[PDB]
């Protein structure tokens, strides 16, 4: 019919989801940390972007800091989620890049872009030597390497206990998003 005439004219993609997949993504929207299983990667990438858009959307309306970085854990994969999936459908409104490993420097991306998408030793090599966990509001680790920077997550938690009992303020942390097909 007409409104389907005008959709077969529309050639800008489409991050709108089955009932299925925001019922598995319900409580990353409501910013709590969780995993996400989902039966295809192109299923899996479409959730992770929605969720990141929701995320920084709601960030910048109640005026917080948002940063999302999705981890990776092989270099082609990071051009891949930054060229065919992150820039083409959010590059109207956030700042997108992919590091993977040469003139541009991880922490200065992280200073300078809303969505970074790296490797998860990219990350560990910045924070178990420029960059820390609090700089991010979100983490999408996909195929949820990961032990040091979970380790690292836990306990500054058992920090942030700490500080809270000595009435300091707590160090804010990511919201932790895992992935993974199936
Ligand atoms: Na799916």
Redesign the pocket.
Known sequence: DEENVAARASPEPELQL?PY?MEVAQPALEGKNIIIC???G???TR?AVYIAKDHLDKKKKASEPGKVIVLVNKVLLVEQLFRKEFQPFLKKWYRVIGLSGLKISFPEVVKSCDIIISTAQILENSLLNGVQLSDFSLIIIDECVYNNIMRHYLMQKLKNNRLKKENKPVIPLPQILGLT?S
Do not use: C
């Open positions: 089955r997949q989902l039966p295809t192109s299923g899996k959730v097909a």
